[PDB]
């Protein structure tokens, strides 16, 4: 049993012209064949009815989704992105994690190219503009000593005009020459430096970690209106995550979205004013999808992991468990992920930056 | 040990601790909280963009030096006269 | 001479044009620096190091089967790209 | 004792370190940064990470 | 004034210093452009 979730299990292009297991393709589809090869058994890929993962209705006390089909003998094994939770480990058996993950942050790709007159004060540092002005009057005063109270004012205004930039009194002569060589170097430095930003032009981003989302308010952020992601912050007693929840809990308008697609759309249409918190796995995949305008930032907020689920006290139990460990050590798991996330991806990150010009 | 009595209990215990965020808490306690370096990490929160004053400074000293040289050549001229 | 009024005008206007001509020079340099950065497709390794320029082989033949079976570093990556490149980078005939 | 984690000498085929003290009944449980490897999962039991 | 002799001297010397200051400016731009080119090891692929 498995769920339809990209890029783990998807319907092949010409699935209508195919049958059996050939109809499906994805990370878990390949992972199934690998597990079956090391455990030695034939299998039939089937999609769960209700299309859910594995929850437990409080009232009826009934399990649904894949976890359900396992407990009620509908399936023999579950190969999908099934989270290893305590509530499930009690009813079924989870093999060692075949993919560690967690909660990540998604923001809009920093294409920030605003006006801001502060891109002119950057090339030449504020400290440098100051000293060049101090030395400016520092020369107009030295020249002023070269040449009764008003006579000093008319001269100080003349040396200030000799300052406002453009006979053979050797003294003040070398002053004008050295000052010229001085300003020559500066204007050359300004020109050269200004050429740099407009040549390379690498983008920077504000938010680096989760603590950055709590320390600021300019950039709104939220999670899915329902799921372990939202329930995580609510129950989290950790310092940073606490404040985050407090904000999202009363943030207006609603920072929570209906579906994952809505969340991504909100990040792509807010010009970097809205961040979305979701599972790293799905996030990393989104980053490799057109128009390649989303990116994951910072490390995960918690440590989770998917695993192969097998009915409590099953024969495939131990075998599958070892199989997962064997696959990971052979780097086969990492290979599969690279195949469906980056290789099969549409957005070479270091390639999209190597193929973009201005 | 394979086929132990503590097997299942401990397994569930680990899952329970992680969900209660107790595991993450413990790590933070011994790695970052008990850590000696929140200073080099607070500065690694950000370094900024453009040019320095260092290089430009060297040209400032040669300027004042030229001004001083002139202030010296000036004095001597008035003396000879 | 030293007509302070129009004097600072000439100075400020000079500082104004100074910035502009400096901007023009700097900006003109980036367009020429990048113009050189664009390196012509010289070797096969150049096709793998970039993605802007797509590339492929014949859909059937020793040429295609070469990359598929090749265990060489460069040719490996090339095949990985062509194997999943969309749209199809492979053609029906040589024409 | 030996201050090792858990390896297996090819020749003597003997386990050492904590993993060893578990297989030979020296200890009841191992609480340490013990990596969950296939070679060990075969002789002992690993709880979730 | 127009002392042709020393006149072309001032002109050639001007053209000389023009090239040098242009070279200094251009080269200085390159030292900052390359200074940015040096990308810190962000990933393993960078090693
Ligand atoms: O076992 C579970 N595995 C899951 C695996 C994934 C995915 F990452 F897509 F593989 C997701 N998504 C993440 C992004 O939003 C769309 C679906 C949800 C999962 N849920 C539901 P939860 O209750 O919200 O955690 C589980 O229960
Ligand atoms: O089960 C194992 N757990 C281990 C845990 C750790 C640590 F991270 F310190 F907790 C380390 N170190 C990492 C840094 O170098 C000093 C010691 C080695 C471990 N090894 C040896 P491996 O064969 O090199 O992996 C194991 O076998």
Residue from the list E25, E28, E33 with its beta carbon closest to the beta carbon of A200: E33
The full length of chain B comes to: 81
d(CA C55, CA A209) in angstroms, rounded, equals 39
CA distance C67 to C74: 10
Q: What is the DSSP letter of A20?
A: G
CA distance C49 to chain E (A): 12
Q: Where are the beta strands (DSSP E) in chain A?
A: 10-11, 24-25, 92-94, 99-101, 103-108, 220-222, 274-279, 294-297, 304-306, 309-311
Chain A residues with CB-CB distance to C34 below 8 A: 199, 357-358
User: Considering just the CA atoms, what is the radius of gyration of chain A in Å?
Assistant: 32
**Residue with CA at minimum distance from ligand 1 atom 20:** A53
Give the position of tokens 């991504």.
A264
Residues of C in contact with E25 (CB under 8 A): 25
Tell me the DSSP string of D1-49: -------B-TTT--B-HHHHHHHTTS-S---S-----HHHHTTS-----
CA nearest ligand 2 atom 25, residue: D35
Q: Which two tokens stand for residue C19?
A: 């910035």
CB of residue D35 inside a 6 A radius of ligand 2: yes
| Cα radius of gyration rounded to whole Å, chain D | 10
Which residue in B2, B14, B15 is closest to D45 by CB distance? Answer: B2
3-state secondary structure of A14: coil
Elucidation method: X-ray
Given a contact cutoff of 8 angstroms between Cβ atoms, the answer to whether A354 and C50 are in contact is yes
Write down the residue that tokens 């990470």 correspond to: D49
This structure's resolution (Å) is 3.6
Partners of E45 on chain A (C-beta within 8 Å) are 350
Residue nearest to ligand 2 atom 21, measured at CA? D5
Mutation test of ligand 1: which of A50, A69, A282 has the most ligand atoms closer than 8 Å to its C-beta? A282
Contact C67, C82 (CB under 8 A): yes
Query: Does the beta-carbon distance from D45 to B14 stay under 8 Å?
Result: no
Q: Indicate yes or no: CB of E25 within 8 angstroms of CB of A350.
A: no
Identify which of E32, A344, A189 has the alpha carbon closest to the alpha carbon of residue B59: A189
Rounded distance from Cα E2 to ligand 2 centre (Å): 85
Compute the distance from residue B5 Cα to the ligand 2 centre, in Å: 27
Confirm if C45 and C77 have CB atoms less than 8 A apart: no
User: Closest Cα to residue A259, out of A276, A243, A234, A245?
Assistant: A276
- Where are the extended beta strands (E) located within A120-192? none
Q: What is the Cα–Cα distance from A256 to A221, expressed in whole angstroms?
A: 8
What is the whole-number distance in angstroms between the Cα of residue A86 and the centre of ligand 1? Answer: 16
Q: Which residues contact C63 (CB under 8 A, 6 or more apart)?
A: C57
User: What percentage of chain C's residues is helix, strand, coil (to nearest 5)?
Assistant: 60, 0, 35
Place of tokens 């215990």: B13
Task: Decide: A287 in ligand 1 pocket, CB within 6 A.
Answer: no
Peptide bond into A96 cis (omega under 30): no
Contact D37 A329 (CB under 8 A): yes
Respond yes or no on whether the N-terminal peptide bond of residue A291 is cis (omega within 30° of 0): yes
Pairing, β A24-25 against β A10-11:
antiparallel
Query: Are B10 and D47 a contacting pair at CB < 8 A?
Result: yes
Distance (Å, whole) CA A189 – CA E31:
11
Q: Which residue from B6, A94, A329 is spatially nearest to D45, judged by alpha carbons?
A: B6
Rounded to the nearest angstrom, the distance between the alpha carbon of B41 and the centre of ligand 2 is: 25
- Output the CA C54–ligand 2 centroid distance in Å: 45
| Token pair belonging to B10 | 């401990």
**Residue carrying structure tokens 């050590």:** A329
Residues of B with Cβ-Cβ distance to A90 under 8 angstroms: 12
- Residues making up the binding site of C for L-glutamate: 62-63
For the Cβ of A280 lying below 6 angstroms from any atom of ligand 1, the answer is no
| Closest Cα to atom 5 of ligand 1 | A81
Chains D and C touch (3+ CB pairs under 8 A): no
Give CA–CA dist B58/C39, Å, rounded: 38
* Residues of chain E contacting residue A191, judged by C-beta atoms under 8 Å apart: 25, 29
Residue A8: count other Cβ atoms within 10 Å of its Cβ.
24
CA D17 vs. chain centroid, Å, equals: 6
Residue of chain A whose Cα is closest to the Cα of E22: A188
Q: Tell me, in angstroms, the distance from the centre of ligand 2 to residue B16's CA.
A: 25
- Closest residue in chain C to residue A340, using alpha carbons only: C84
Does ligand 1 have an atom closer than 6 angstroms to the CB of A83?
A: yes
- As annotated, the binding site of C includes 62-63
Alpha-carbon distance of B52 to A246, in angstroms, equals 41
> No. of H helices and E strands in chain B?
4, 0
- Chains in contact with A, counting 3 or more C-beta pairs less than 8 Å apart as contact: B, C, D, E
Query: A292 with A264: CB under 8 angstroms?
Result: no
Region of A307 (left: φ > 0; alpha: ψ -120 to 50; beta: rest) is beta
Residue D31 sits at φ, ψ, to 5 deg, of: -110, 95
Domains and CATH numbers, chain A: 1-101+307-346 (3.40.190.10), 102-111+205-306 (3.40.190.10), 112-204 (1.10.287.70)
């Amino acid at each position: 049993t498995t769920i339809l979730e990209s890029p783990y299990v998807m319907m092949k292009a010409n699935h209508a012209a195919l049958a059996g297991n050939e109809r499906y393709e994805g990370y878990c589809v390949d992972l199934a064949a690998e597990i079956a090869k090391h455990c030695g058994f034939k299998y039939k890929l089937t999609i769960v009815g209700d299309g859910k993962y594995g929850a437990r209705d409080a009232d009826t006390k009934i399990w649904n989704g894949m976890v359900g089909e396992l407990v009620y003998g509908k399936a023999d094994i579950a190969i999908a992105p099934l989270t290893i939770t305590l509530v499930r480990e009690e009813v079924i058996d989870f093999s060692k994690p075949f993919m560690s993950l967690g909660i990540s942050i998604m923001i809009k790709k920093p294409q920030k190219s605003k006006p801001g007159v502060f891109s002119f004060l950057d090339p030449l540092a504020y400290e440098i503009w100051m000293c060049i002005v101090f030395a400016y009057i520092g020369v107009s005063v030295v020249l002023f000593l070269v040449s009764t109270n008003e006579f000093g004012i008319f001269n100080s205004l003349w040396f200030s005009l000799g300052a406002f930039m453009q006979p053979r009194s050797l003294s003040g002569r070398i002053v004008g020459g050295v000052w010229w060589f001085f300003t020559l170097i500066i204007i050359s430095s300004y020109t050269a430096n200004l050429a740099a930003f407009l040549t390379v032009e690498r983008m920077v981003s504000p938010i680096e970690s989760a603590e950055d989302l709590s320390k600021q308010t300019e950039i709104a952020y939220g999670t899915l209106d329902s799921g372990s992601t939202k329930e995580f912050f609510r129950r989290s007693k950790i310092a940073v995550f606490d404040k985050m929840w407090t904000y999202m809990r009363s943030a207006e308008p609603s920072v929570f979205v209906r579906t994952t697609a809505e969340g991504v759309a909100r990040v792509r249409k807010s010009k970097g004013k809205y961040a979305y918190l979701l599972e790293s796995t799905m996030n990393e995949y989104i980053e490799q999808r057109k128009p390649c305008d989303t990116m994951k930032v910072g490390g995960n907020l918690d440590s989770k992991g998917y695993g192969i689920a097998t009915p409590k006290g099953s024969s495939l139990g131990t075998p599958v468990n070892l199989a997962v460990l064997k696959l990971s050590e052979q780097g086969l798991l990492d290979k599969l992920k690279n195949k469906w996330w980056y290789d099969k991806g549409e957005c070479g990150a270091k390639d999209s930056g190597s193929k973009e010009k201005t | 040990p394979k086929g132990s009595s503590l097997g299942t209990p401990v397994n569930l215990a680990v899952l329970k601790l992680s969900e209660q965020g107790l595991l993450d808490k413990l790590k933070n306690k011994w790695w970052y909280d008990k850590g000696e370096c929140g200073a080099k990490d607070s500065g690694s929160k950000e370094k900024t963009s453009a040019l320095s004053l260092s290089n430009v400074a060297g040209v400032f000293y040669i300027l004042v030096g030229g001004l001083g040289l002139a202030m010296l050549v000036a004095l001597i001229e008035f003396c000879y006269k």
